[PDB]
C-alpha cells in the first residue's frame, strides 16, 4: 500500500533565495500509514494536492494491505 | 502467513531468505495437516463453542446484559454473539495461516477506538475470547489445544 | 544483548578455543529449558495488563503514594507508573527467553537509577511493585517458571536498589 | 593602562564552536548530476549513522532507496526516514541503549539537537511504549520541526540552538563526543520546577 | 541466533513474542539435537575438509598460488588454509545457532574492505567456500547436507 | 511553569485539602497586585530596546570587554550579548506577570551556568549588566514595580552566580 | 581563507580536494607575495588613511559630528576614528587571507545589531569605509588598488 | 571541464562566479595550448604505451595471465588491453578537460561493482594504470609529465 | 551539466571515437569565444541588480501586474518576481559561460512551466521582462556577448512558452 | 580549525596590531613551503590504501592482535582498524596542508583517548601503526615532505599516548 | 609541583630518553631568565601589603561590595578578602620563580571555584581584583617581569572564571 502524489506547495510565509522548484512542485511515493499525516501536513503548509494515484496499493483488500 | 512475514523481513534487511527461515517455511509446509485438522475441528463446532462461551461470559460478567449495559436486548445479545463469531473466524484464519497477521489486519488494529465509539467494554470482549479459548481448548487434544490457545492467547493479549 | 548461546560462544571465542564438553553441556541445559521458557513467555504475553494491575492492587493502591503528595498521584503519574511496570514485565520476559540478563542491564538498568533519582521516583516502592509483579507471575506460570522469572525480577530489583 | 596580551590561546578558544560556520549543509536542489547525488547520499549516511557506513554492511544495503532517490520518485526526507527505519540503524543505536537514551540519540541524528524539555521526552517515550522504534522515527521526520529547519531535500545537520536553555549545552555535550565514547545518557530527564 | 532475532524483533515493536515466533523458538529448540549432530560432523573432520577443499581450490584457481598471486609461498598458503579454517569454524557456529548472525556478525560485514586491503580476489575465496561446501555435503546424509549447505550458501552469497 | 495561583492550587492539592483562608488571602494578595503587574508589563514592553541599550551603556560599554580580547568584542558577540540581555528582560517580565520565579529556573537558569562556562562568557560582567538593567527599569516603572521587577532580576543574578 | 574554504567545501561533500581547487590554492600561494605587499602598503600608512578618511567623512556627513549626532565631542570622535581603524585592520586581514572570511567572521556578522544598539547610522559608516577606500586606492598602483578595493567593496556591500 | 564545475559551485552557493574563479577560467583558457600538446602526444603514442605497460603489468603481476586467472587466453588479454585503451582515452579526455570529471562520469562510478561482477581484480587494474602512468610520464617532458601524472594519479587513487 | 567541451567529449564518446580534428576546431572556437565570455560574465556579475531593476522598470512597472489585480501586486509577489528575474539572469550567465544551454534545460525549465501554470503566473509578462533584460544586458556588455546572452535568454523564453 | 595564515591573523588581531614584519616573514615561509605541501598532498592522495595496508603489514599483521583474543581479531574489528588508520592518514594530510595541527586536536584528538579506553583499543599498538604509516609515507614523499608529515604524525601519537 | 627544570626532566624521563638539544635549550632559557625572576621576586616580597591595598583601592573600594549587602561588607569578610588577595600574590610569585604554573592548579585552583561558589563569593569581582593586582605589580617591576607575572595572574583568573 503506497500512494503517488503530485503536489504544488507555495511559500507564502517568506521568500527563499535558493532554488526551490524541487520543494514547490514534486511527485513522491508515500506509504499508506504516513499518508494521513503527510496529507494533513500538506494541508497546513497551504500547498494544494494535485494528483493522487495509489498504483501500488491494490485497494479494496482486507488482507495484505 | 509465515511466508509473507519472512519475505518482508528479508526485504527490510535487503537480503535473501536465510536457510533458517527456509527451514521454518519447510516445517510450516509439513505441519499444514495438523493446522488443517485444528481449523477443521474449530469450524465444525463453532455454534456449540459460541453458545457455551456466551452463557459463561454472561454468567461471569452480568453488567453487559443488565439494563443500561451494552448488550441489552435480543438484537444486542445477537450482535454480541456475532462479534464472537467474527473473532472465532479470525482465530481459525490465524490458525491456518501459521501467523497472527490476518487476525491483526482484519480485527485488531482499531478495536479500542471503535469499541470506544460503540460503548462496548473491551475487557468484557477479552473475557468473551477467554471463555471461547477455554471451551475450544477443552474440545481439542492437548497439543492442538496448545496451538489454538497460542492464537487465542494472542487475541486476549491484544485486547487488554 | 546476548542469550545463553551467544554468551557461551563469546566465552569460547575470547578463549579462541573450540566448543568443548562444558559448553556443549551448557547449551544442552538451555536446549532442555527452552520449551518451558517458550510456554511461560506465551502465558505471560497472555496476561500482561492483568499482572500489572494485580501488582498495583497488591502494593501501590490505597497507600500514600496514590494519595495527594505521592509520586503516583496524578493521572499522568499513574499512566507513567503503569508504563514503567509494563516495561519491567516485558523486559523480564525477554531476559527469561534469552536465559541471560544482559538485556536488563543493557536496556533497563542503564540509566534507570539516575532517572528515578532525578525525577523523585521512590525506588523502594517500585521495588515492592516489581516484587509483587514477580509474586503474581510466579502464581501464574508455576513453580520453576516462576523461579526463572523471579531471578530476572530480582536482577531488576537489585540493579534498581 | 595597556599591558601586553597574555593568555592568547584562551582568547582563541573563547567562543561558540567555529564548526557552525565551517559545516556546510546539503541541498539536493539539482538532482541531475550523479556525483552531486553520490556525495549527498554519503553525507546522509555519515550524518545519520555518525560514521562511514561501509564497515557495517555486508553488501551495498540501501541500493533500493538510493536508486529511488536517483529517480526522485522519493524525496530526501523519506530517504532519511527509510534510513532510520531499517535494521542497521536499529542494530546500531536502538539495541545497546534504553528508550530514554535512544530518544536523545534519535534527536541527535534526525532533528540535529537534543530534546527540548520534559514534555518532549514524555511524548517520545509514550511513542516508544505504544508503537515501534520505526514509528518513533516516523514521528520525528514527519514532524513540523524537521520540515521547518531542514526541509524535504536537505540532509539534516548539526544545529546550534539557543532559546530552550537546556538545548545548547545538551547539544554540545552530545555532538562533542565520538560514537561509543561512553554508555552514559547525557541528560536523563529535566528536574521539575 | 533465533532467540536473539525473535526477541529483538518483538523488542522494537514494543510487544511480547507472538505465538508464531514462540513455536518457531520451540521448533528450533527441538531441532537443536540434529544441529549438534551436524556440528560434530563438521568439527570432527575439519582436517580433511580444509585439506581437500584447499587442494580442489588450487586445482580450480591456480593463479592465486602461482607467483604473482596472493597465496604464493609456504606461509601464504598456510594463511590461506587458516582463513578457510576460520570460515569453517563460523559455519559450525551458524549451524549451532540456527541463524547466520554469528557468521555475519563475526566474519562477513567488512569482508570486502578487508580482502580489498589485503589484495585478495574475493571470487577465489568464494570458490574456496564452494569447495568446502562440496567436501562437507559430500560427508553427510541428505537433510544434514541441505541444512549445512544453507549456511555454506549464505557465506558464498555474502561474498558476492 | 506556574504562577502564584497555580502554585497555591498545587500546594492545596498536594495537601489534598480544600482552599482554606490562607490560600484565599494569598490569592487576594495576587489579585490586588495584578493590575500594577499589568501596567508595569506594558511599560516594560514599551521600552525593551531602550532598557537594554541603557544597560550596556551603563555597564559594558567602554570597558575591556568591548575592546579586543574581550568576550563582547566582535559584532557577532555584541549581537549575541544584546540577545541575551533581551532574554533576561523578557523573562523577568514574564516572572513579574506570573508572580512566581518558576519560569526563570525552568527556562533561563536551567543550563545557563554550564553554557556560559563552556563558551567562556564572563558571569560577573553579565551579572553587572543585569543589575544595571534592573536599575534602569526600576527608574522606569517606579518604586514598588521596580522592586517586584528587581526580585526576579536578583533571582536571575543569584542563579547565574 | 582560501585554504579553509576549499577544505570545508570538499569536507561537506565527503571528497578530497578537486584539482581545480588545488590550482586555486596554488595560485593564491603564488599571489601571496603581492598580497603581502598590499598589506605592507595598507599597514605602514594607516595614520594618513584614518586621518584623511575621517576628514573627508566629516566633510561629507557633518550631521554625525554636529550636536545631536553619534560622534559628537572629543572622545566620541576618537571612538569613531577607532572604529575606522578597526575596519582598516580587518581590511588588511582580508587582504592577506585572500578571502573575506576574516572580515565577515570578525566584524561584519552582527554589525547592524551592534550599530543599532549604539544608535549609529550605518550609512555614515559605509561612507567612512568609502572614504577609506578612496584614500587607500589613491595610494597604490592599479592592480593593487583593484585587489584592495575588492575587500573595501565587500565591507561597504556588507554594510548595506 | 573547469567551467561546469565552477558553474555548479556558483549555483549551489547561489551567487555569481567570483573573480578568483573567473581568473581560474581565464588561466585555463590560456593554458589550452599546453594541454592540447599533452593530449596530442598521448593520442600519438597510445599503442606503444599500451604495449609496454601491458607487458610490464604481466611481468609484475602474473596471476591475471595464469590459468584460472581473469585474463587468460588471447581474447581475454585483448580485452584487458582494450580496458587499458578505455582508461588511457579517459585520461586524455580529462587532460584536455582540465578536470577529472569526465573520467568520473564515464569510468569511475561503478568500476568496483562491475569488476566484482566480472571477477577482475581491481588492484591489478590499478597496477595497469600505474604502468601506463610510468610509461607516459617517461615519454613526456617533465612539466607536462607532472600534469598528465596528476590525472593518472587520480585514476589510480580512485581505483585502490 | 555540460560545457561546449563536455558536449564535444560526450558526442565523440557516444559514437565511440577519439578526438578528431573537427572536435579540436569546436574546442578552439569555444576558447576564442571564452575569453570575451569571461569579461562579459564579470561585467554582468558587477551590474546584476541595476540590470534587473532596469528590466522591471522597462516592462513590468506601470502595467496591471505591479498595479492591483495583477500577479505582481503584493510585496510577497514582488519579491518573488525580483527573485525569479535574478535567477533568470544568473542562469543565463552560467549558460553564457559554459557555451551550452543544457543548464537552462536542466535546472531552470525543468518544472517551471507547470508551477507557472499552477500558480497562475502570466507567461507573456515574464517573456517581455526577460527580453527587456536581454537588450539591457546587450547595451551593457556589448554586441557579440549581447548575442550570446540573446540566444540563452531566447532559450529560456522558448522553454517557458 | 585554522591554518598558518589564520593563526598569524588571529595573533595579530588578539594583539589588535597590524601585520608587522615578523608576521610577514611567517607568511612568506608558509607561501614558500605551500607548493611542496600541495605536491606531497597529491602524492599522499594517490596512495592512501597502499600506505595503510603497508602500515598494517609492517606492524599489526602476524602479531597477537590479529590472532584470537586480540582487539584486531574479527572482520568488523579489522575493517574498523583500517578505517581508523585511514582517518589518521587523511587528517595528517589536512594538517600538512594547513601547516597547523589545530584540526588534529579539534577533530581527531578530542575524545579519542576516552573512546579507545572505553572500547578496549590498545593505544600502544595503534601508536606503532601510526609510526609505521609515517615511516612509509616518509619513504614515499621524500625527506623534507616526510618530515613535515611526521611532525603531525608525532602530534597524533603524542595526543593519543 | 614542578618548575621548568623538573617538567623538562619529567618529559625526558617519560620519553625514557636522555636530555637532547631541545631540553638543553629550554634549560638555557630558564637559566637566562632566572636572575630577572629572582630580582622580581625580591621586589614583590618588598611590597606585598602595598600591592594588595592598592589593588583593593583600585577595584573593590567604594563599590557596592564594601557597602551593606556586599560580600566584602563586614570586618571578617574584609580581612578574609585581604587574606585571599595575599594568597594570590604569594602564589603568583611562587609560580613566577618556578617558571611553571603547576603550583597554581595544584594548590590554588584546586577547589577554589567550588569553595567560592559555596560561600557566595563573587568570582568576577575577585577576578577584577587580581587583574588590578597584576596591573599594580607590572607597574612595580617593569615591562617584562610584569609580563611574566601577568601570565600567572591570567592563569589564576582563567582557572577562577
Ligand atoms: C532564554 C534563556 C537562554 C539564555 C540566556 C541563553 C544564552 C546563550 N548565550 C549564548 C552566547 C553569548 N552570550 C553572550 C553574552 C555575554 N557575554 C559577555 O561578554 C557579556 C558579559 C554577556 C552579555 C551581557 C555572548 C558574547 C555570546 C556569544 C559567544 C560566542 O559567540 O562565542 C549562547 C551560545 C549560542 C548562541 O549564541 O546563539 C546561548 C545558548 N540561551 C537561552 O536559551
Ligand atoms: C525500558 C527501560 C526504561 C524504564 C523503566 C524507564 C522509566 C521512566 N520512568 C519515567 C517516569 C515515571 N515512572 C513513574 C513510576 C513510579 N513512580 C512511583 O511512584 C511508583 C513507585 C513507580 C511505578 C511502579 C512515575 C510516576 C513517573 C512520572 C514522573 C513524572 O511525570 O513526574 C520516566 C520519565 C519520562 C517519562 O515519563 O515518559 C522514564 C524515562 N525508561 C526506560 O527507558
Ligand atoms: C573469522 C573472520 C576472519 C577472516 C576471514 C580473517 C582473515 C585474514 N586473512 C588474512 C590474510 C590472508 N588470507 C589469505 C587467503 C586467501 N588468499 C587466497 O588467495 C585464497 C583465495 C584465500 C584463502 C583460501 C592470504 C593469502 C592472506 C595473506 C595476505 C598477505 O600476506 O598480504 C589476515 C591478516 C593476517 C592475520 O592476522 O591472519 C586476516 C586478519 N580474519 C578473520 O578474523
Ligand atoms: C572589529 C569589529 C568591531 C567594530 C566595528 C566595533 C565597534 C564598537 N564601536 C563602539 C562605539 C562607537 N563607534 C562610533 C563610530 C561611528 N559613529 C559615527 O557617527 C561614525 C559614522 C562612525 C565611525 C566613523 C561611535 C560614535 C561610538 C560611540 C557610541 C556611544 O558612545 O554611544 C563600541 C563601544 C565602545 C567600545 O568598546 O569601543 C564598539 C564595541 N567593535 C568591534 O570589535
Ligand atoms: C571507459 C569506462 C569503461 C570500462 C572500465 C569498461 C570495462 C569493460 N571491461 C570488460 C572486460 C574485461 N576487462 C578485463 C580486464 C582485466 N582483467 C585482467 O586480467 C586485467 C588485469 C584487467 C585489465 C586491466 C578482462 C579479462 C575482460 C573480459 C572479462 C570476461 O570476458 O569475462 C568489458 C566487457 C566487454 C565489452 O562490452 O567491451 C567492459 C565493458 N568499459 C568501459 O566502457
Ligand atoms: C533556478 C530556476 C528556478 C525558477 C525560475 C524558479 C521560480 C519560482 N517562481 C515562483 C513564484 C513566482 N514567480 C513570479 C513571477 C513573476 N512576476 C510576475 O508576475 C511576472 C510574470 C514574473 C516576474 C518576471 C511570481 C509573481 C511568483 C509568486 C506567485 C505566488 O506564489 O504568490 C516559485 C514559487 C515559490 C516562490 O514564491 O518563489 C518558484 C519555485 N524556481 C527555480 O528553481
Ligand atoms: C576522525 C577522528 C576519529 C577516530 C580516529 C575515531 C575512532 C573510532 N574507532 C573506533 C573503533 C575501533 N578502532 C579500532 C582500531 C584499532 N584497534 C586495534 O587493535 C588497532 C591497534 C587499532 C587500529 C590501528 C578497532 C579494532 C575498533 C572497533 C572496536 C570494536 O568494534 O569493538 C570507534 C568505535 C565506533 C565505531 O567503530 O565505528 C571510533 C569512534 N573516531 C573518530 O571520529
Ligand atoms: C559595620 C562594620 C563596618 C565598618 C567599620 C566598615 C568600614 C569601611 N570603612 C571604609 C573607609 C573609611 N573609613 C574611614 C574612617 C575613619 N578614618 C579616620 O581617619 C577616622 C578615624 C575614621 C572614622 C571616624 C576613612 C577615611 C575611609 C576611607 C579610606 C580610603 O578612602 O582609603 C570602607 C571602604 C569603602 C566602603 O565601602 O565604605 C569600609 C568597608 N565597613 C563595615 O561594614
Curated annotation (Swiss-Prot), chains B, E, G, H:
Short name of one Pfam family: Phycobilisome
Binding site for (2R,3E)-phycocyanobilin: 80
Originating organism: Picosynechococcus sp. (strain ATCC 27264 / PCC 7002 / PR-6) (Agmenellum quadruplicatum)
Keywords, sorted A to Z: Antenna complex, Bile pigment, Chromophore, Electron transport, Membrane, Photosynthesis, Phycobilisome, Thylakoid, Transport
Post-translational modification note: Contains one covalently linked phycocyanobilin chromophore. The chromophore on position 81 is added by the phycocyanobilin lyase CpcUS.
Assembly information from the UniProt record: Heterodimer of an alpha and a beta chain.
Alphabetical list of PANTHER family matching this protein: ALLOPHYCOCYANIN ALPHA CHAIN, PHYCOBILISOME 32.1 KDA LINKER POLYPEPTIDE, PHYCOCYANIN-ASSOCIATED, ROD 2-RELATED
SUPFAM superfamilies assigned: Globin-like
Annotated Gene Ontology cellular component terms: phycobilisome; plasma membrane-derived thylakoid membrane
Family from the record: Belongs to the phycobiliprotein family.
Predominant localisation class: membrane
Subcellular location: Cellular thylakoid membrane
Protein name (record): Allophycocyanin alpha subunit
GO process annotations (BP): photosynthesis
Biological function: Light-harvesting photosynthetic bile pigment-protein from the phycobiliprotein complex. Allophycocyanin has a maximum absorption at approximately 650 nanometers.
Membrane topology type: Peripheral membrane protein
Keyword NADP in record: no
Domain of life: Bacteria
Swiss-Prot record, chains C, F, I, J, K:
CDD domains recorded: APC_beta
One Gene Ontology biological process: photosynthesis
Residues annotated as binding (2R,3E)-phycocyanobilin: 81
Family membership noted in the UniProt record: Belongs to the phycobiliprotein family.
Function, in words: Light-harvesting photosynthetic bile pigment-protein from the phycobiliprotein complex. Allophycocyanin has a maximum absorption at approximately 650 nanometers.
Post-translational modification: Contains one covalently linked phycocyanobilin chromophore. The chromophore is added by the phycocyanobilin lyase CpcUS.
Topological relation to the membrane, as annotated: Peripheral membrane protein
Quaternary structure, from the entry: Heterodimer of an alpha and a beta chain.
Cellular compartment(s): Cellular thylakoid membrane
Organism lineage: Bacteria, Bacillati, Cyanobacteriota, Cyanophyceae, Oscillatoriophycideae
Protein name: Allophycocyanin beta subunit
One Pfam family matching this protein: Phycobilisome
Swiss-Prot record, chain D:
Modified how: Contains one covalently linked bilin chromophore. This protein autochromophorylates.
All copies of domain PBS-linker, residue ranges: 6-183
UniProt record, GO biological process: photosynthesis
Keyword Transport set for record: yes
Keywords: Antenna complex, Bile pigment, Chromophore, Electron transport, Lyase, Membrane, Photosynthesis, Phycobilisome, Repeat, Thylakoid, Transport
Main localization category: membrane
UniProt-recorded Gene Ontology molecular function terms: lyase activity
Entry GO CC: phycobilisome; plasma membrane-derived thylakoid membrane
Superkingdom per UniProt: Bacteria
Record localization: Cellular thylakoid membrane
Assembly mode: Heterodimer with ApcF (a variant beta-allophycocyanin). Phycobilisomes of this organism are composed of a two cylinder core, from which six rods radiate. The core is mainly composed of allophycocyanin alpha and beta chains and of minor components.
Its job: This protein is postulated to act both as terminal energy acceptor (by its phycobilin-like domains) and as a linker polypeptide (by its repeats and arms) that stabilizes the phycobilisome core architecture. Has intrinsic bilin lyase activity.
Family from the record: Belongs to the phycobilisome linker protein family.
Protein name: Phycobiliprotein ApcE
Part of the full-length chain shown: 691 to 883 of 886
